[PDB]
Amino acid sequence: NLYQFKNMIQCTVPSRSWADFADYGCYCGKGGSGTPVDDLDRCCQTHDNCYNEAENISGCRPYFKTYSYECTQGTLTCKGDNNACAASVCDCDRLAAICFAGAPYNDANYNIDLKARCN
Ligand SMILES: COc1ccc(C(=O)O)cc1
Ligand SMILES: [Ca+2]
Q1: CB atoms inside a 10 Å sphere around CB 72
Q2: Cα gap 52→65, rounded to integer Å
Q3: Which residues act catalytically here?
Q4: Dist CA 27 CA 43 (whole Å)
């Protein structure tokens, strides 16, 4: 669920406030359309598409599904107890949190005008 994703982010990018990723580029946050503006926004585009794919699983609600995971000693793990929905959603979130850690953060690309820039 979103709260768990935030915690993944807080654990893999402890240098930034997590809210730095909640409104970035065309794809990080409420947004989901347009050309991704940079490598970090590409991470979010793949995460958004991963959620749309997980939605196809019956009863699977990526913002709300509580999965089982651990963040310890620099590593994220999706646990074995997870059903198919939980395992997909946890995987979407783990891979995005890892991608976030590896991508440049461009202040300019924070809180961009989606209507105008993401058609
Ligand atoms: C916790 O930060 C985020 C990041 C991306 C999204 C999303 O693109 O759905 C939601 C919350
Ligand atoms: Ca999005």
Answers
A1: 8
A2: 14
A3: 47, 93
A4: 8
Residue of minimum CA distance from atom 3 in ligand 1: 22
> What experiment produced this structure?
X-ray
From 16, 47, 51, 52, give the residue whose CB has the most ligand 1 atoms within 8 Å, as the site to mutate. 47
Contact between residue 28 and residue 114 where contact means Cβ atoms under 8 Å apart: no
Instruction: Residue 72: name the closest of 2, 6, 11, 1 by CA.
Output: 11
> Please, where are the H alpha helices in 1-119?
2-12, 39-54, 84-102, 114-117
Q: Scan for tokens 């935030």, then name that residue.
A: 6
Which one of the listed residues 23, 41, 47, 91 is annotated catalytic? 47
Residue 80, marked binder: no
